[PDB]
Write a protein that binds this DNA or RNA. Structure first.
Ligand SMILES: [Mg+2]
Ligand SMILES: [Mg+2]
Ligand SMILES: [Mg+2]
Ligand SMILES: [Mg+2]
Ligand SMILES: [Mg+2]
Ligand SMILES: [Mg+2]
Ligand SMILES: [Mg+2]
Ligand SMILES: [Mg+2]
Ligand SMILES: [Mg+2]
Ligand SMILES: [Mg+2]
Ligand SMILES: [Mg+2]
Ligand SMILES: [Mg+2]
Ligand SMILES: [Mg+2]
Ligand SMILES: [Mg+2]
Ligand SMILES: [Mg+2]
Ligand SMILES: [Mg+2]
Ligand SMILES: [Mg+2]
Ligand SMILES: [Mg+2]
Ligand SMILES: [Mg+2]
Ligand SMILES: [Mg+2]
Ligand SMILES: [Mg+2]
Ligand SMILES: [Mg+2]
Ligand SMILES: [Mg+2]
Ligand SMILES: [Mg+2]
Ligand SMILES: [Mg+2]
Ligand SMILES: [Mg+2]
Ligand SMILES: [Mg+2]
Ligand SMILES: [Mg+2]
Ligand SMILES: [Mg+2]
Ligand SMILES: [Mg+2]
Ligand SMILES: [Mg+2]
Ligand SMILES: [Mg+2]
Ligand SMILES: [Mg+2]
Lengths: 54, 155, 117, 70, 95
RNA sequence: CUUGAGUCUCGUAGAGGGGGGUAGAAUUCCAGGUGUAGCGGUGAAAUGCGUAGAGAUCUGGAGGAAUACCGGUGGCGAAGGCGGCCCCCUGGACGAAGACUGACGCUCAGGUGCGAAAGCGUGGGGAGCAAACAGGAUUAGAUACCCUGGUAGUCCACGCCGUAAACGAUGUCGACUUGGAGGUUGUGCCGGCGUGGCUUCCGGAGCUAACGCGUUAAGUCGACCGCCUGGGGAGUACGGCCGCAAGGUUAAAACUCAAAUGAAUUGACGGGGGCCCGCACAAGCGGUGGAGCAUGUGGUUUAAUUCGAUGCAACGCGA
């Protein structure tokens, strides 16, 4: 409540969640290459996990 | 909350045994702002724990605490029409908070005369895997063990 | 009773369940377990964990026989399509060989209609 | 996707070979696809969407380099 | 479903009471867990109006309708709540 | 007369059509062996299948239907449509040089033929799928969606039907008018430079109500045909023709409304999407709902129970 959460971590978990829910890379809302790397990083980790879920 | 809460508080350690741990334990038992009343009730219990185990106080009250801390809890998560109970690690500080809460909760729910008696008995029983307090932990652990399959979701 | 040494482990990973059966190398069944039999039902039945149990509780269904070698032979798209291959390792077999044998028609028959929901 | 295990090869190197074996043979894609019958109109209408997208994935790699942020 | 009637510039007779109660008894078939509900009837110049508010199991549903009579107002109102109640149910029985 | 139209000569590419063979994958069944308690299915379940031995796994046999990969905003056809491999019959297009005919052309009411899927007739066939139908669920109900089965039908031969958002919602033929990036198929001359056909995307002038179209025009013109004339009533009724039937085709009126419509604009809304917040959830602490009493309100009561405040934002409120 007093201070904003880590932007990189949040960006990595937003990436994961679009991942699992099956959106396309290139929905990524970041052009800040730093946050972008976190977003895709999550999105690709999530692509692995979808396989073993139903 | 959505942002991060900044500024953790400062528990002063116990006047007697000079422990932040026991100081927390008082607050948890404390009711309606009556810190002194709680301070009494606590020491008189440890007396009567010490006077039977004969194993110090800040070292006896501990042994109760170890018999009852959980290591894995369950979080609920709505999936389809159903609700998935899912097992998660417990944070060290959390499993302190839970042990101390379950001990207090178990104490009050007894028929003994003083509060001090109830606490004492409960802490003793805790040390020999016995009371409701320790029953509760067992049950928690049973549930997380049951639905282990949902260990690795992130959902 | 008659010891073997060299076996093969078929794994049938459906979306709803995971059957696993050890057989001699002429395909004669020796033991088997499932997620359904392992003690999981519905939501749980269809997980990689429930499939893991199956594999290892099928491993201690074939102690009677010799052991060492085991060529795994996996079929279907279920979640039980590795957690088993893992479990057989720590069960203490040596996996010489491992192959997807998921059947695919080269056209074949008309699949069922698509689910509206 | 038929990997034999090599001399002294760790299990968790065979396994990852085996995974990558059928990733590149695209098995689960094929099975996923044939779970249900798609009308030949639907299949063919999918094929256009793929095309009108791929095409516009030979546009960003050009046009962005022309424009500029901040 | 516990009911309550008001009248802001209207005398609640024992048609308008009996009538309104019967009309509201339907709503329970759209959602079984209705609790207390308050009804209000108005007459301002020429406009007849009827609003109700419905405490339900995890919600609060409200609508108001205007008729040329109060009966026609209440007729209108019951059609409005029906739709809202169904919407509610369906986003709980959501499997 | 040779520029439009056509004929011959040499080649090219192609799921163009018709007939007959055949090969591998898979599903279902039947018969064996192994083996033992569950399988199957769903959001969750149940019906169903299984100790009369299923499911799983291996071997042998039968039978039908469709042809993974190649495969592409690829190719062919008047359109509908056409996809394994191999022979037999057969149509069209395109190019390179030459020769030949000499306006033999374009369009076309009536007419004639082809015409997806469903459907109909006769005789076959029947793996998978699946209207109807039956059972299980869900729900206030659920003649549905979801699950378990499953008959016509889907397949072959011959004959009917003549319809589809049969669509580029864009008739056919010819001429003319800035460009760019591709795909596919010929052929010149030196892996560069030309010259043909078909095709995909983008855009200029112009055009358009706008959206958009843009040398494959919805631009600029010429030739012929088809069709429209406010919305409902109605592509319906009556009549004729066609059909075994289902039905198709041609095609009104009374009555009634002052609108009905197209494209674009600002908002609002979505059981649409993205991103951020909030005692919103989560983590917690103490309560209200039960009792007695205080107090306000509704109701009833009254001679009068003064008047006002009424979802959130009236009900210890004006007082
Ligand atoms: Mg199915
Ligand atoms: Mg009505
Ligand atoms: Mg066979
Ligand atoms: Mg001459
Ligand atoms: Mg004609
Ligand atoms: Mg005709
Ligand atoms: Mg037909
Ligand atoms: Mg019939
Ligand atoms: Mg027939
Ligand atoms: Mg027949
Ligand atoms: Mg079926
Ligand atoms: Mg069905
Ligand atoms: Mg039924
Ligand atoms: Mg034939
Ligand atoms: Mg025929
Ligand atoms: Mg028509
Ligand atoms: Mg038309
Ligand atoms: Mg032209
Ligand atoms: Mg254009
Ligand atoms: Mg034109
Ligand atoms: Mg126009
Ligand atoms: Mg009309
Ligand atoms: Mg007619
Ligand atoms: Mg007629
Ligand atoms: Mg007749
Ligand atoms: Mg409009
Ligand atoms: Mg919104
Ligand atoms: Mg809470
Ligand atoms: Mg509470
Ligand atoms: Mg009460
Ligand atoms: Mg009370
Ligand atoms: Mg009053
Ligand atoms: Mg007044």
């Amino acid at each position: 409540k007093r201070q904003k959460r880590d932007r990189l971590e949040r960006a990595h978990q937003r990436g994961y969640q679009a991942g699992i829910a099956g959106r396309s890379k290139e929905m990524c809302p970041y052009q800040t290459l730093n946050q972008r790397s976190q977003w895709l990083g999550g999105w690709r980790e999530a692509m692995a996990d979808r396989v073993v879920m139903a | 909350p959505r942002r991060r809460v900044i500024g953790q508080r400062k528990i002063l350690p116990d006047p007697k045994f000079g422990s932040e741990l026991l100081a927390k334990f008082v607050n948890i038992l404390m009711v309606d702002g009556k810190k002194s009343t709680a301070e009494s009730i606590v020491y008189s219990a440890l007396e009567t724990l010490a006077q039977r185990s004969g194993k110090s106080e800040l070292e006896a009250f501990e042994v109760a605490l170890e018999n009852v801390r959980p290591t894995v809890e369950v979080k609920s998560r709505r999936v389809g029409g159903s609700t998935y109970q899912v097992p998660v690690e417990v944070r060290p500080v959390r499993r302190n908070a839970l042990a101390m809460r379950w001990i207090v909760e178990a104490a009050r729910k007894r028929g003994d005369k003083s509060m001090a008696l109830r606490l004492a008995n409960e802490l003793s029983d805790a040390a020999e895997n016995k009371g409701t307090a320790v029953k509760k932990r067992e049950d928690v652990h049973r549930m997380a063990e049951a639905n282990k399959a949902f260990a690795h979701y992130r959902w | 009773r008659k010891q073997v040494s060299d076996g093969v482990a078929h794994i049938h990973a459906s979306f709803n369940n995971t059957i696993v059966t050890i057989t001699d190398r002429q395909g004669n069944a020796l033991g088997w377990a499932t997620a359904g039999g392992s003690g999981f039902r519905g939501s749980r039945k269809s997980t990689p964990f429930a499939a893991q149990v199956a594999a290892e509780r099928c491993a201690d269904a074939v102690k009677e026989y010799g052991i060492k070698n085991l060529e795994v032979m996996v079929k279907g798209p279920g979640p039980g399509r590795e957690s088993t291959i893992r479990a057989l390792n720590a069960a203490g077999f040596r996996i010489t060989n491992i192959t997807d044998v998921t059947p695919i028609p080269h056209x074949g028959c008309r699949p069922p209609k698509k689910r509206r929901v | 996707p038929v990997i034999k295990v090599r001399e002294n090869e760790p299990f968790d190197v065979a396994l990852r070979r085996f995974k990558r074996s059928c990733e590149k043979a695209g098995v689960l894609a094929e099975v996923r696809r044939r779970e249900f019958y798609e009308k030949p109109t639907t299949e063919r209408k999918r094929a256009k969407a793929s095309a009108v997208k791929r095409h516009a994935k030979k546009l960003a790699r050009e046009n962005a380099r022309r424009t500029r942020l901040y | 479903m516990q009911l309550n009637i008001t009248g802001n510039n209207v005398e609640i007779t024992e048609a308008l009471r009996e009538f309104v109660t019967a009309k509201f008894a339907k709503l329970e078939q759209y959602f079984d867990r209705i609790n207390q509900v308050y009804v209000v009837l108005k007459v301002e110049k020429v406009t007849h109006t009827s609003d109700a508010t419905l405490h339900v199991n995890g919600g609060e549903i409200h609508a108001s309708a205007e008729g040329q009579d109060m009966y026609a107002a209440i007729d209108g109102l019951i059609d409005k709540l029906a739709r809202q109640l169904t919407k509610h149910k369906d986003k709980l029985k959501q499997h």
